[PDB]
Paper text:
More recently, two more reports showed that two different compounds, anagrelide, and nauclefine, which target PDE3A, also induce apoptosis through this PDE3A and SLFN12 pathway and that the apoptotic activity of DNMDP, E2, nauclefine and anagrelide can all be competitively inhibited by other PDE3A inhibitors, like cilostazol. One of the most interesting features of the PDE3A-SLFN12 complex-dependent apoptosis is that the pathway can be dose-dependently triggered by many structurally diverse compounds (e.g., anagrelide, DNMDP, and nauclefine) and cause cell death in HeLa cells. To elucidate the molecular basis of PDE3A-SLFN12 complex formation induced by the aforementioned compounds, we treated HeLa (SLFN12−/−) cells with their endogenous SLFN12 was knocked out that expressed Flag- and HA-tagged SLFN12 (K213R) variant with anagrelide, DNMDP, or nauclefine, and then purified the PDE3A-SLFN12 complexes using Flag-HA tandem antibody pull-down. To investigate the molecular basis of the PDE3A-SLFN12 complex triggered by those compounds, we subjected the purified protein complexes to single-particle cryo-EM analysis and determined the structures of the SLFN12-PDE3A complexes with anagrelide (3.4 Å resolution), DNMDP (3.2 Å) or nauclefine (3.2 Å). SLFN12’s helix is positioned at the mouth of the PDE3A enzymatic pocket, and the side chains of its L554, I557, and I558 residues comprise a highly hydrophobic moiety for interactions with the hydrophobic phenyl ring of anagrelide, together with the L910, I951, I968, F972, L1000, and F1004 residues of PDE3A. These hydrophobic interactions between these three molecules (anagrelide, DNMDP, and nauclefine) and SLFN12 “glue” the PDE3A and SLFN12 together. Importantly, based on the sequence analysis and structure comparison with its isoform, PDE3B23, we found that anagrelide, DNMDP, and nauclefine shared the same binding pocket of cyclic nucleotides in PDE3A. Therefore, the occupation by anagrelide, DNMDP, and nauclefine of the enzymatic pocket of PDE3A would in theory preclude the binding of cyclic nucleotides, thus inhibiting its hydrolysis activity.
Numbering used by the authors:
A (entry chain C), B (entry chain A): 669 to 778, 800 to 1028, 1070 to 1102
C (entry chain D), D (entry chain B): 2 to 568
The structure:
Amino acid sequence: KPILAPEPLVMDNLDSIMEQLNTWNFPIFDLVENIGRKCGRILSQVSYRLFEDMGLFEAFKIPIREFMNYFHALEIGYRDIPYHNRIHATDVLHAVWYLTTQPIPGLSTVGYVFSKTYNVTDDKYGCLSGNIPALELMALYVAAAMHDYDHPGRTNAFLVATSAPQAVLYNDRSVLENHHAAAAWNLFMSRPEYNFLINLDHVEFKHFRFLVIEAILATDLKKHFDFVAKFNGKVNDDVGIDWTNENDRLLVCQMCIKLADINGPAKCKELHLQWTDGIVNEFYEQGDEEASLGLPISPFMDRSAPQLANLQESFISHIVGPLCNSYDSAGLMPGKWVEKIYCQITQHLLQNHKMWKKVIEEEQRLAGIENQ
Amino acid sequence: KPILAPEPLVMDNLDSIMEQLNTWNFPIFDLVENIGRKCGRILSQVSYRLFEDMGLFEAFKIPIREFMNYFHALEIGYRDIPYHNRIHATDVLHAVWYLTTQPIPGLSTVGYVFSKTYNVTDDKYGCLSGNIPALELMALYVAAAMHDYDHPGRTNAFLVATSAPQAVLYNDRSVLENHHAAAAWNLFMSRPEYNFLINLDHVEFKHFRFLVIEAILATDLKKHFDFVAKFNGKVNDDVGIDWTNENDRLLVCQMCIKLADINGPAKCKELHLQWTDGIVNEFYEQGDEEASLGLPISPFMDRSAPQLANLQESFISHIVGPLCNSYDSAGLMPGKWVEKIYCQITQHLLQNHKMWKKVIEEEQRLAGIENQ
Amino acid sequence: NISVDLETNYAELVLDVGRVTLGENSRKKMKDCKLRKKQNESVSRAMCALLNSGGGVIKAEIENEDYSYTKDGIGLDLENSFSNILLFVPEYLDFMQNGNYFLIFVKSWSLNTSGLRITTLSSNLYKRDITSAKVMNATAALEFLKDMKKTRGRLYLRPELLAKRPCVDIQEENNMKALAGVFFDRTELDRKEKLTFTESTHVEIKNFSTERLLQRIKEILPQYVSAFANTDGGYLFIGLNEDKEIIGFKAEMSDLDDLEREIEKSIRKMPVHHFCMEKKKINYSCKFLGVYDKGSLCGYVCALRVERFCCAVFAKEPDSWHVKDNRVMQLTRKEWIQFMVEAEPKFSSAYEEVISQINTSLPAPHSWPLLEWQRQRHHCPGLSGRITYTPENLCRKLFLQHEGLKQLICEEMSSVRKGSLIFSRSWSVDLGLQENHKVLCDALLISQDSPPVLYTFHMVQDEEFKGYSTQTALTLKQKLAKIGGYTKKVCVMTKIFYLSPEGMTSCQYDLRSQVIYPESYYFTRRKYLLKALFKALKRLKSLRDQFSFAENLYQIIGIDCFQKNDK
Amino acid sequence: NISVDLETNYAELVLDVGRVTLGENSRKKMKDCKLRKKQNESVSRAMCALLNSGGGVIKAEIENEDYSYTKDGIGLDLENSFSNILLFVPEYLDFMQNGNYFLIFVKSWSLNTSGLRITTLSSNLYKRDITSAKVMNATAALEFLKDMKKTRGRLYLRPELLAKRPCVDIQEENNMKALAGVFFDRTELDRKEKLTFTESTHVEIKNFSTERLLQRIKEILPQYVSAFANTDGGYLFIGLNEDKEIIGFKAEMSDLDDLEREIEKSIRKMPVHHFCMEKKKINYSCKFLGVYDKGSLCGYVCALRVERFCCAVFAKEPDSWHVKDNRVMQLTRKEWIQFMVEAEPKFSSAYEEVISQINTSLPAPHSWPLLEWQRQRHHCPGLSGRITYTPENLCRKLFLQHEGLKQLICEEMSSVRKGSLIFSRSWSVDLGLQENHKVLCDALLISQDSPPVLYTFHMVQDEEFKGYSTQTALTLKQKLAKIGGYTKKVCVMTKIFYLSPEGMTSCQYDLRSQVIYPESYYFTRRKYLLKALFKALKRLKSLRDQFSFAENLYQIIGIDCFQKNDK
Ligand SMILES: O=c1c2cnccc2cc2n1CCc1c-2[nH]c2ccccc12
Ligand SMILES: O=c1c2cnccc2cc2n1CCc1c-2[nH]c2ccccc12
Ligand SMILES: [Mg+2]
Ligand SMILES: [Mg+2]
Ligand SMILES: [Mg+2]
Ligand SMILES: [Mg+2]
Ligand SMILES: [Zn+2]
Ligand SMILES: [Zn+2]
């Protein structure tokens, strides 16, 4: 009756691509075309590979059968919408696994667990898997996996405006994020075979549940400026990020997932374009359903008069920009020294912004010419 | 099909007691014996009388029929448990109506609405109904009416410990308060005849809903010290309570309901004793159900080894004490000048605490004697 | 006296202090110490007044016929006064001789780590050191007043009990206080007898072998009374010598009464400020003792006792000035203590917090500043995207009609590496000032170099609007420095244009080629100016559309508003 | 030198400064100015050291044979030094003559509105006023260093452009700097020629008609170099007179080289502290010019130019002291700048925030204090509920066995209006100290009057434990004042008892009847002492069970823990 799993646990035909999984520009859609796109098993496979890489199946003694069971039920639960689907969850999972298990120049590593190779002998690069215990990292990974579960395909403001049942059930305060966390944990606790945390203590499980819910709720964009200002006031006027104080580590994981969630305009131009197509298509769907009700069509959600470049430029300038600047002023963005330090992510971000400002200026000028 | 109302709207036999409703030691249980205790219509009648006193039926043009409809559905919804029942809601409603519409020596009054008589000609007593607009006051009254709706009879910690469904649905963050607000507003929006806010604007309704949810969520005792410290840091180091800044008025209504919620040990000894019996009986019920599951029996919830005096003394010293001191240092507790100012509430609080410390010392000494 | 100079083409407050000698050798050689001290106190009043109220410039006419300032300096009393008011001088002052005048450009006093909010020439609150009565400086008076205001009064440990100590021959200040106390109740003094106590924190002794003794008392008594009333009280004896041999002053009856009455008035004229519920007065008691030599009275000795007070006691009003409208005035006692005691007010919501902390500028690019964003990225065709025409709806409206205006703005912003000009129907109203309707619009160009300009456009070929533009630039300077929290040297230049019916030229006024400033007034910062403008507009309750940061994205995301602080 | 006095029965740091004259007339009449200045600097070092490290007491032997202090005072240089370090003297010092010694009881330096964290005799950072080089005082140095640390360096506006100004004959300081610059590159000087510039913020001129000229330069040059390097740099010319007529010093070759080398060493020995990424050094350039009269060389003139620096430049190490373990030592440059620049650390969660702000005490009762709560309200049968035996589980355990202990505690707390004593297995370990196992327990009675006592119990009829109890009381005093934030005068008394096998008496030591304190050390406050104890235990990471506030109510309500700041 319950969704258990596919017959073979770990598939073999999707190899030679999972090994090139430590690159920021991961070819995710090539993998979706690699795995059978009919059923959908991308999130479960990527999760298994990443956990086996981190060795967390040993550091916590987790049974792989129930692990695959739970994550397959999860990925089946993700609605089939254009943007907030299982591919988005896999992307966020990979982005968090990258940001927390890759060399970060100017770090000070101190039952932790490091990535597979990591070639760590020097004293110039640290990884966040050395400053953060294994429990909190597994909590961050699981929270990133189940963070957009059962997404209806709308925004918080839409459900709040039309007074949807799910918006009254949560009193208009982080409607979607609370719904995701609640439904995911409910599905977890539903069956006895999904229980892949069987070898955890009681206090371990309670702290794990707390951290997972915190990470999931931290990805609400209404709290964006609060989180950004708190991170600024903790690495600007304070001593910085004390890797002993647990609130500091919690804030670090929260910001890490906040940035791994919106990472479209920080990859190559092709991946960024595809993610942009997805998000804007979902916006157009919402605009259709919102004109069907007689509500005034929201901004940027009109498939007759799109303003895609305006949307993406405003987004990159107002949300992803200051967030990357805050996350980088604390010296946490992964990079390398040059013979001074080359950060690929900020480079991709700047290039994409410049492309959008080309398109904006070109369209604006042409309209100004023709309109006279 | 829906609960509409009793046949006559406002009953007449419960008179000569509703007029003595401006006394802090209101004879609430005499009224419960006055009204038919079988069905239960105390909350609706008290609400009608208080609103008609404030004239809010005119200042907002509310139909009394749908008003009584909604509040009767509300009072029917209140579970029949020993403490968190419709009598408790009526008590909190009366306490808020007292704290916000009675003379407060040393106040500076500035579409407001005042109480029925209030005999206001002097410049020594202000009431909070002059510093707070009518909309926010009606929001506070309605929030106090529906604040313990559908109470299961347990604590937040109990539902969180046994992982009840209602605790997973809200992610262990203000489980009971979110449940109350959500179920009450859901019942309101359910039928078209409950809509007693028909003559409100759209932005008026949105702000009203916001304020009501805020007031309801403010009565969670896990936020007690946060609210107390915030009120201390706003009337100790600041200019005080700027009655223009809306966040100040919001904090004032939140603290007013926080204190009107727990007002047992601030009335006469008889009312205080009755409320104490109710609360401790509910605790004993929870202890029965929690020993039935094999969980360790919580403190103070053992009907075989009660520690009632310890509970009530610790409560009065740790929760109600500092809250009254904070609410009084801002000069908001209603009192009178003496020929310097006599506050009945703090007097009742001190007397009840001294009684409990008599009982504590007596029992402690006798046990120390016999035990040898 | 000191009077605002209304006939100068500076966009600033220009105080006129009259004639003043200069040069160190000539200030020294000046054969009149009274006039020298008068000139010094006048210049210092002007400087304090300009520090307390925005910026300014002090203008003094060179009195001596021959002055150079490249071979004469300024002086040594003037430098002492300057260094006394200010911590770091070259950060606040700039000196410039312009022909027959000596100008001093004064920055505005800015909140620093010390916590001071104003500058005072002298607090006039005296404190009692171990033996000497000294006046509290700025930080001493600050801590004293803040401590007294914290407790709603001043704590004492009134004689409820003497501490039960061991038995030992110990000597302390309480011995001197008690001996002076028994001296105070003594009834007659043997002329030429020795004292058993000396002067301490409760006992001061004065000789005053003067024939008058009235003017000396009237001029010196308030500072000792304020010293005692501010630390533990004590006794003041007048009539001894420096060797403690009782001598007394040779005065006769019917003079003792007038002298006591003069003491009474001289103490009752002393100010006082209570933080306590009740309002007492300076409790003391005068008394006169005879100094009988053998059987005769060799004179008298005046004994005065002051009790410890509940709050502050000034010897005079505090020396703190400011130019209110014109005719620079001294701060009142209530206003002075309000500036000293009460905190700085600020809310700083998280949105504005990030919009401000976008100004880190560590050793790296740190792109994406949120204050210079604009949606319409296409104005002024031949150019790149480097001038944010801010309001975006007033600018387009103003450019549609008024055909010469767009071409004028393009001609004007050509030589600007990066700036952002902000239009308005009238900046005077936005800065809380009287408006005049003849002005079409205004503007405010804030570039990297080239201090902020204030373009004033109009179509009337009759008037000048020099007064309007100068008043607006003045108030903008003062608002920036005081309310906006800009902590450097600023000067708002000006320009006036004439837009006729198809005439887009005739700049009727160019303030840059009329007035000369020091070298450091020309290099502003263009980002702290934007933050200062944001904060000044917010505190003025007129931050409406400038600094666009469009909200079609926020309204979708769900983020709220960011200003109009009543919600 | 200065050495800790290890053989005094005070529970404090007692510094011994040797012999010291006293009395104002005798300090004046002392016919040796060098010894007087040496004594003064010694006392001031001791006082600064005691201020920086908890409290203390300065002990000096009265040098002159006849001293009274009730008819001689202290002095006038000593009072000047005291008033220079401290803002308000009677708040920090108390003087007491005990036979053949003069004691000074020094409170601990407490954080005030100024923002200072330590006291320094002299920062040794010189700043350049308009014409004179003055040393920065405490608040000037504080603001200077905080400003430099904020920008990770010190900003300049390097000559990218000269401001395009109008044309006018204007005179400014840049004229004097440029003229001195052309003077610096001049190749030969006519003896007895006039200068066209005077001294300003970039130009200092010195005569020095000395035969040696090496010691004078070596002792005066670092302060001018530090003045210039801290504000805009400048030139220093040596060889002129007060009338600007070039004279030069009469020196011959083979002396110029040694003099230049001495200048080089005297500049390279000057400290410096960088907040910037790179670490440059003091860039300057010496040069010697001839003063040819007619065809002969009448001497030489030394021209020295110092460039503006990126960060601080001291003339010597900062005069700031503290007693580390013994043998009072001077603060190091890194530690000094760390105390000055870095903030005060504090978290102050909301629970602890309310547990502290329960100490309002406005003019009203304000009942329900949360720090003196206890569940077991029944100890010591004949009494009321007015002594909170705090730990409640160590106290009951200790009272069950050790039969004499409960009766002893009852005998002891009889004469106490209201207090709260706090037991422990060993207070020495709780205060971060070496333990000794022979001690049974301890205690800490904190009443209204009667300053805090430290009962030390033990059952060994061989030893004394005076050293143990005195060290523990000393460290408790210092911890309270420094970490707990108690801002008044405290003294931790002591008592030692002997609990034999059924012997509950024989107090082997009672510190109150052994040492005499000033009158104000006996009246503590009992609520700020409790807050101070809370904060000190928290910062020491040993706040476990003291201050009960039982949590059977919180665990039901759901409120969390309140301490162990790692969660
Ligand atoms: O342009 C992008 C984008 C571009 N590449 C990748 C991801 C992206 C995600 C988002 N947007 C802008 C709109 C939006 C996005 N996440 C939201 C969440 C809530 C409400 C609105 C939004
Ligand atoms: O002693 C009283 C009491 C006494 N008179 C009136 C009301 C009262 C209400 C309460 N208690 C203590 C326990 C408790 C109460 N409200 C809660 C809410 C949540 C969890 C625990 C509690
Ligand atoms: Mg989401
Ligand atoms: Mg997401
Ligand atoms: Mg509740
Ligand atoms: Mg309730
Ligand atoms: Zn007073
Ligand atoms: Zn440096």
